[PDB]
Each structure stands twice: as structure tokens, then as C-alpha cells.
Amino acid sequence: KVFGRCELAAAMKRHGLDNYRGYSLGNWVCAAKFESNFNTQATNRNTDGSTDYGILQINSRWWCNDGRTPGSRNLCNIPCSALLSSDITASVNCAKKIVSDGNGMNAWVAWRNRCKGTDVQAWIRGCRL
Numbered sequence: 001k002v003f004g005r006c007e008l009a010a011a012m013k014r015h016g017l018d019n020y021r022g023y024s025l026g027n028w029v030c031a032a033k034f035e036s037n038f039n040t041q042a043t044n045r046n047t048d049g050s051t052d053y054g055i056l057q058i059n060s061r062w063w064c065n066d067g068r069t070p071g072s073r074n075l076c077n078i079p080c081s082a083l084l085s086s087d088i089t090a091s092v093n094c095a096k097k098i099v100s101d102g103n104g105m106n107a108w109v110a111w112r113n114r115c116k117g118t119d120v121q122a123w124i125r126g127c128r129l
């Protein structure tokens with residue numbers, strides 16, 4: 001599924017991301033835009049052989065099992081395929097663990113480089129939430 005911007009903001013709020021660990025909804029929407037262009041099915045291979053899955057590009061290195069990332073953990077206890085669903089529950093639940101692990105949203109390189117410090121409220125401007 002490719003979400004619209006306000007549609008994803010709404011879903012994110014429904015699933016409890018709005019101010020999760022102090023990060024406003026706009027942060028999460030901005031991260032999703034630059035990680036996956038709001039496409040739940042996005043996958044991208046990393047140089048180290050791990051793969052990033054879903055709206056928030058969650059990495060098989062640590063967070064999900066894809067059966068092809070040696071020496072890998074599966075800290076969200078889910079098949080990485082679960083992160084590609086039109087239903088965002090799995091991605092949201094796993095992202096709550098990631099953002100809680102000590103470095104906040106800096107875990108998402110595209111958030112650090114493209115969202116951090118910017119007017120992230122713009123991402124939710126006009127949305128009925």
C-alpha cells in the first residue's frame with residue numbers, strides 16, 4: 001500500500017506513535033516519507049547484506065528475521081515480511097522498540113539527514129487526525 005500523507009498520519013496516530021518517546025507525529029511522517037515514500041512494500045538491500053523493510057525501512061541486521069542475514073538478530077520477533085503489510089501494526093510496534101533503544105529517531109538515517117531540526121509539523125499540516 002502507498003499511503004497518502006494525512007492518511008498515514010492518521011493511521012500512525014491510531015496506532016500510538018503521536019509523541020511516542022517525545023517524537024511528534026510530523027517526525028514519524030517525515031521519516032516514513034524519506035525512508036519509503038509512504039510505500040509499505042519498500043525493500044532495500046544494504047551493503048552488509050542485511051535488508052530494510054517497509055514504511056520505516058526496518059533493518060534485518062537487528063530487528064526482524066528474513067532468513068538471509070547472517071549473525072543477525074530478530075529483536076522485534078517478527079518475519080521481516082510482516083513489515084510489508086498494508087496494515088502498519090507490525091511496523092509501528094517494531095519502530096516503538098527501535099526508537100526506545102537509546103538513540104531516539106537517529107536510528108533512521110534519513111530522519112537524521114532530512115527531518116531532524118526541520119519544520120516537521122508541515123507533514124501533518126491540514127490533516128484531519
Ligand SMILES: [Cl-]
Binds near residue numbers: 005033
Ligand atoms: Cl507527500
Ligand code: NA
Binds near residue numbers: 066067068072
Ligand atoms: Na538471518
Ligand code: NA
Binds near residue numbers: 109110113114
Ligand atoms: Na539520508
Ligand SMILES: [Re]
Binds near residue numbers: 011087088
Ligand atoms: Re490500523
